[PDB]
Amino acid sequence: SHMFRKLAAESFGTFWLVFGGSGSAVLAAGFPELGIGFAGVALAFGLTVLTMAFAVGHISGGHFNPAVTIGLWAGGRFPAKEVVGYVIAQVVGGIVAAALLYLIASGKTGFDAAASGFASNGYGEHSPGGYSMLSALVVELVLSAGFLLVIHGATDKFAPAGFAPIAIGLALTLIHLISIPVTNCSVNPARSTAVAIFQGGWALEQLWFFWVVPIVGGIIGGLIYRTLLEK
Amino acid sequence: SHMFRKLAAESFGTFWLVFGGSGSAVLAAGFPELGIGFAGVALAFGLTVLTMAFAVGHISGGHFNPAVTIGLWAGGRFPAKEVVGYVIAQVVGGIVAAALLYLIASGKTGFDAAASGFASNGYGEHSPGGYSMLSALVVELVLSAGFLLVIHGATDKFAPAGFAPIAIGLALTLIHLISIPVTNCSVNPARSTAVAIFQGGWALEQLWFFWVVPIVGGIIGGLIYRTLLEK
Amino acid sequence: SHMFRKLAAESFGTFWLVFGGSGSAVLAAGFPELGIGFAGVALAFGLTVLTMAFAVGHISGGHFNPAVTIGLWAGGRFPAKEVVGYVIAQVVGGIVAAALLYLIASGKTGFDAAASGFASNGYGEHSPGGYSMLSALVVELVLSAGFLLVIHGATDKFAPAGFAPIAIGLALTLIHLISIPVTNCSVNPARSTAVAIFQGGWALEQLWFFWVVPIVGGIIGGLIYRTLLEK
Amino acid sequence: SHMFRKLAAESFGTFWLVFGGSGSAVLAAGFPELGIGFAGVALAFGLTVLTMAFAVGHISGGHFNPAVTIGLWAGGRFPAKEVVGYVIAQVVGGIVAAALLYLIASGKTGFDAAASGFASNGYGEHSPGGYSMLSALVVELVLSAGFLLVIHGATDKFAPAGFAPIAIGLALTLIHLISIPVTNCSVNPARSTAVAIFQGGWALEQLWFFWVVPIVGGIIGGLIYRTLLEK
Ligand SMILES: CCCCCCCCO[C@@H]1O[C@@H](CO)[C@H](O)[C@@H](O)[C@H]1O
Ligand SMILES: CCCCCCCCO[C@@H]1O[C@@H](CO)[C@H](O)[C@@H](O)[C@H]1O
Ligand SMILES: CCCCCCCCO[C@@H]1O[C@@H](CO)[C@H](O)[C@@H](O)[C@H]1O
Ligand SMILES: CCCCCCCCO[C@@H]1O[C@@H](CO)[C@H](O)[C@@H](O)[C@H]1O
Ligand SMILES: CCCCCCCCO[C@@H]1O[C@@H](CO)[C@H](O)[C@@H](O)[C@H]1O
Ligand SMILES: CCCCCCCCO[C@@H]1O[C@@H](CO)[C@H](O)[C@@H](O)[C@H]1O
Numbered sequence A, B, C, D: 001s002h003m004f005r006k007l008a009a010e011s012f013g014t015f016w017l018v019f020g021g022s023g024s025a026v027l028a029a030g031f032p033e034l035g036i037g038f039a040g041v042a043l044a045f046g047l048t049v050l051t052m053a054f055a056v057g058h059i060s061g062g063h064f065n066p067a068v069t070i071g072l073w074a075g076g077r078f079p080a081k082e083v084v085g086y087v088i089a090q091v092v093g094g095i096v097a098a099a100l101l102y103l104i105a106s107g108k109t110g111f112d113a114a115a116s117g118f119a120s121n122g123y124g125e126h127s128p129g130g131y132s133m134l135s136a137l138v139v140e141l142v143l144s145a146g147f148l149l150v151i152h153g154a155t156d157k158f159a160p161a162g163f164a165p166i167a168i169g170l171a172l173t174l175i176h177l178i179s180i181p182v183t184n185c186s187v188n189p190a191r192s193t194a195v196a197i198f199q200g201g202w203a204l205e206q207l208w209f210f211w212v213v214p215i216v217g218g219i220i221g222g223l224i225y226r227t228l229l230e231k
């Protein structure tokens, strides 16, 4: 219903994503002896979409991601008219979460967002595993396209009803289980932007890559489903 | 149906929560080499709500948490009349689980609830990660509000039916994956009270914080859903 | 339909349980550096019930456990007539899995079922954590009763349809996340018997405890649901 | 509908499987300190089927596995006519994923697919745990048969509708939690072939075992369900 409801849902769900997924990375993943690892961060990322696509999916469509919104537009499933408002709402909801995360994070002696990366996406020298830019393009392109094909299929008219938030949220856990070592896993321009702002340095300088590549990837995934798989 | 059924359900489900989530913390999380970590405790917390909201959710609403009950009241989804009886039922069911957990725990040489914290919530000197009180307020406030927005949305008239226990239980796993390092993760006054009693010391002295903050947080989350997202 | 179908389902699902849950313990849990821990064994246990209660639940009821069968009888949900045939079917399906597991396990240099315990349940000197017999009784009694209350509730006429295998399977993961350190987690006489036979020693000598306690526990859980929660 | 849609779905979902499950093994499982282990690889494997059986299951049946396709044929659930086209589609979709994975993997200094095994299945000297060929046959035979019985049951006319992708995907996680130490877990000829090609050596020499055994196993599982459990 009336756009305000949908934009609020998109801003709150993207907030959830960044605060949830990035907070687990910043606060819990490398905690001595008991911390949750990349597996726990990956679970946390997927649970934000699972939980918010259940909570507000009926309201806005449950995108929480500029590449989902744009890929859904290329899949002939979303109107170009509401695209820009969704992306701004996602970025704003994302940023507000990184700021609050940054304040929570600063309450521990020795915190340093620039030096730790603040869960930012990067490649080459700023890839966790030491992976080249090409490794990073290929992975984010395949994983963004795949994510969009799952989103498109699971929300298809003929797919089983009500299960979509499970498929989509879990796809995002999968995607994280594969690619954290390569790019810290983006597949989401709004989530990359939100943390890059607070990292302040290299993250802002590679940010472009995490707009171009997930968006291009989400377009391809949406065109693959629309042209090859749907009717 | 008739209040006795609902209060029994609330007492049993909160019992499940404390015994399940706190028992995994006390007995299994730091077990040498094979223990389950914060990730396993977080899974365990979420599974108590998932499993009991399926089992007794049809009976009482499946709250298991004084902040859920109060936030559901502020969301215009629950009557102020049954609020007090739910909270007492939750606290009583919680306490009975900590006592039984404490007796199970005492059957191993060297157990010491005061010195180990008995999975109690704290801040500052009693935060697992060494996080300030402000870090603790912000996290429990955002995570309580978010939890309440998921609860409100997933149980909305227009949300897919029957899936709510999955969304809500998993939200609680998420919430734990983020915040154990900060406050040992409360979001639940009854769960905090239950373990604080048996820790006996500092936990009882910071207990107030874990009534005020999760309740205030759950109120905001419920008012955000009711005023900004629902109709 | 005609008893043969149901007994086959019970024998195959209990086979799945033992081979799945116990195999993960015997083969994968303590594997150097990459092994799955108690958290992975707990996930594996729950996934056997989740997966078989989906596969054959429509056929037999999906019990896979003599304490479930007996507790379902005490809950006024299962006829005393088919009780004995279910329990024998469970034990037989369990034993066949431990034998096949034992043969798979023997294909690695240095395997020794008596000395490793072969994932057997025990207490006192044969508890993983060094827990007393009383610690073991209390935990298996509370966890068996709780399991039975989840089973009873999730399969209640008024509970959401089709979700029961998720609630029940996950409850069993929970139960394992809490109690592996205490008794290696039984809640299942047939699963205890199956591995005890191949351990050959102390496991057979404490086996009685894992018939009495889970059964008594499952009775209480079923009577709690029938008398306090159902109508 | 018209075969092209189904073959595309099978090729894309098997691509997802290999890239998802094998990529997590190659890129993330042994990552220093934070890596995901066998538990995370097992989760990743199951999530590919869960996510694609939701996305394209309505299109092709959601097989993603030559042993599923053939076992579904032996279960009297799939026509022999479309069997060959499915298997070729699976192998092709698998191979394209291993090539892209191999290129992503090569972007890190010191990568070596022959020397690391490239997540390939093997036995004896090429089993992760040092397990004999007999250990490997028994495990892949029981786990393939079991997988096929879950697939058959969960997609039975009388099983709860829409839940099948959850049961099946999770069964595959289970299967991986048990058997990675034994054979690196195949249960899938197409997934074995895809990585064996890029490993280049011993993997190609034992590849036959991972066609014969999962197929034979999937046949038995399908005949067990059709003859003993279905009508
Ligand atoms: C919806 C608003 C966000 C738009 C995406 C911003 C992309 C950031 O681009 C960065 O800015 C360049 C020039 O100022 C940097 O030098 C460059 O490295 C790029 O990442
Ligand atoms: C919607 C918010 C997007 C903000 C992205 C703007 C890009 C910023 O560019 C970087 O700004 C400097 C920060 O002071 C960096 O030091 C520069 O290297 C520059 O790339
Ligand atoms: C929302 C789209 C983000 C802006 C897209 C930038 C594409 C231009 O290509 C690259 O951009 C530069 C950043 O200013 C890089 O430094 C260049 O190497 C160029 O390849
Ligand atoms: C539903 C009953 C539980 C009510 C909440 C109890 C709050 C506990 O407050 C504690 O008691 C103070 C004074 O006795 C302590 O000194 C203080 O630190 C506070 O945490
Ligand atoms: C429903 C049960 C709530 C119980 C909470 C009461 C608060 C207790 O206050 C603390 O009691 C002493 C225990 O003997 C502590 O030592 C004190 O510091 C005091 O804060
Ligand atoms: C159910 C509500 C619990 C009681 C709320 C107490 C609020 C009062 O604020 C703080 O309470 C004291 C505990 O007695 C603290 O020690 C004080 O610092 C005060 O800030």
Ligand SMILES: CCCCCCCCO[C@@H]1O[C@@H](CO)[C@H](O)[C@@H](O)[C@H]1O
Pocket: C087, C088, C091, C193, C204, C205, C206, C207, C208, C209, C211
């Ligand atoms: C459905 C058949 C399984 C029945 C349960 C068998 C219980 C095993 O009892 C054990 O046998 C005693 C005497 O032979 C042992 O000494 C005793 O320790 C007990 O555990």
Ligand SMILES: CCCCCCCCO[C@@H]1O[C@@H](CO)[C@H](O)[C@@H](O)[C@H]1O
Pocket: C091, C193, C200, C201, C204, C205, C207
């Ligand atoms: C349905 C199978 C149940 C089998 C349980 C029988 C109990 C066995 O008792 C033990 O048998 C000896 C094995 O040779 C042990 O050494 C004894 O200590 C005895 O307790």
Ligand SMILES: CCCCCCCCO[C@@H]1O[C@@H](CO)[C@H](O)[C@@H](O)[C@H]1O
Pocket: C208, C211, C212
């Ligand atoms: C299916 C029920 C299993 C048999 C129940 C045995 C109950 C008897 O109590 C205990 O049994 C002995 C085993 O033979 C113990 O060794 C005794 O200590 C006794 O407490």
Ligand SMILES: CCCCCCCCO[C@@H]1O[C@@H](CO)[C@H](O)[C@@H](O)[C@H]1O
Pocket: D087, D088, D091, D193, D204, D205, D206, D207, D208, D209, D211
């Ligand atoms: C759908 C096409 C894939 C068919 C399965 C190929 C099986 C590979 O067999 C391997 O080839 C032998 C002879 O060339 C090897 O020496 C042998 O070890 C075998 O694994």
Ligand SMILES: CCCCCCCCO[C@@H]1O[C@@H](CO)[C@H](O)[C@@H](O)[C@H]1O
Pocket: D091, D193, D200, D201, D204, D205, D207
């Ligand atoms: C559809 C693709 C299936 C490809 C499997 C063919 C088997 C290859 O056999 C192996 O080929 C050599 C690679 O150059 C190995 O060195 C040989 O040992 C041989 O077994």
Ligand SMILES: CCCCCCCCO[C@@H]1O[C@@H](CO)[C@H](O)[C@@H](O)[C@H]1O
Pocket: D208, D211, D212
């Ligand atoms: C699609 C089926 C794959 C081919 C089946 C081969 C079965 C033959 O048995 C074994 O095959 C040889 C591989 O060429 C082995 O090396 C032999 O030991 C033989 O046992």
